[PDB]
Design a protein around this ligand. Structure first.
Ligand code: NI
Length: 341
């Protein structure tokens, strides 16, 4: 049955609620972003109105074959009316096409649903600054103080210099980057760019990236693996067995793999700086786990909330255990007391 934190009070609306079948009384189904835990349930047989960004709409149409007449894409930063309720989509700084949703209820309440986000000070200067928010449905993925990680910029810098140095030392080295969904494109694209290569990938992945309105993407990606020295593979293949195997397939074009696993968080962050990251190496294969997150750190989250000062917070992640829920409510009270709201 649909959980309460996927329902928008005082409306017919749900958010990311597609795996429950017909939700009783739901007149519009909103989708924040094209990730499987959020979209699970959509297909060509879905006949209710879906509201989303243009990018997420491209992916519904082309990847899941949802019929066009049920896809209702909205522009960002624009006041729109859905079944008589004013709404706005804002950039979530997550994966391509990911949004937060502002709801203006007829009775005067204002609700922000963050979807999945990585909080940033730039959000303090969007349409959010213009009015008060009474309820916040918050992406609490990493809502605990142990979760620190570097900026996206610092991580990409590390990856670019690592890859450029390896390939300049050995021109027969191949670079491989793991993926399992949209998001984190900057990792493989930045590396390709510094090396003067295109990124080679499967036809299904190339199709996915073509849905995203990336500038000059036809210039950066390709399905011709032969012409490319950066390859994208599924994340599951990013291990010594998987990479030895793939290296076999390259026909003696390459004698060495350098591979990147962009992970969310890993416990080497409590100790290790980005400067001090090292690979796991076996034979002529090295694997780097790098902490490229598309979710808020604890501190980025705390700042955002202390800036917004909502009257009520409703967490949407890590809600399945009493110890989790209870710990999060304790942090919310600290933040509120410390900021004075
Ligand atoms: Ni997500």
């Amino acid at each position: 049955t649909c959980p309460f934190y996927k329902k928008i009070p005082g409306t017919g609306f749900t958010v990311d609620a597609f795996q429950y079948g017909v939700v009783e009384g739901c007149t519009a189904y909103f989708l924040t972003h094209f990730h499987s835990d959020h979209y699970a349930g959509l297909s060509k047989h879905f006949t209710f109105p879906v509201y989303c960004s243009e990018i997420t709409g491209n992916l519904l149409k082309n990847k899941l074959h949802v019929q066009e007449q049920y896809i209702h894409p909205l522009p960002l930063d624009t006041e729109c009316i859905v079944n008589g309720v004013k709404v706005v989509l804002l950039d979530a700084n997550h994966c391509p096409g990911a949004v937060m949703i502002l709801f203006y209820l007829p009775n005067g309440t204002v609700i922000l649903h963050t979807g999945d986000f990585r909080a940033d000070p730039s959000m303090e200067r969007s349409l959010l600054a213009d009015q008060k928010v009474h309820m916040l449905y918050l992406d609490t993925t990493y809502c605990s103080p142990e979760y620190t990680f570097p900026s996206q910029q610092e991580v990409i810098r590390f990856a670019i210099n690592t890859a450029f140095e390896a390939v300049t030392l050995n021109p027969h080295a191949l670079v491989v980057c793991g993926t399992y969904s949209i998001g984190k494109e900057k990792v493989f694209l930045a590396i390709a760019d510094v090396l003067g290569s295109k990124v080679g990938m499967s036809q299904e992945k190339y199709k996915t990236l073509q849905c995203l309105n990336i500038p000059e993407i036809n210039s950066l990606i390709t399905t011709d693996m032969c012409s490319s020295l950066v390859h994208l593979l599924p994340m599951m293949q990013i291990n010594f067995k998987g990479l030895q195997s793939h290296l076999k397939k390259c026909g003696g074009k390459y004698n060495q793999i350098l591979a990147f696993r962009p992970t969310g968080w890993t416990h080497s962050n409590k100790f290790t700086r980005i400067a001090d990251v090292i690979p796991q190496t076996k034979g002529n294969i090295s694997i780097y786990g790098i902490p490229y997150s598309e979710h808020s750190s604890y501190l980025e989250m705390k700042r955002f909330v202390q800036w917004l000062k909502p009257q009520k917070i409703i967490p949407t992640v890590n809600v399945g255990t009493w110890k989790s829920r209870s710990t999060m409510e304790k942090y919310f009270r600290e933040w509120k007391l410390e900021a004075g709201y």
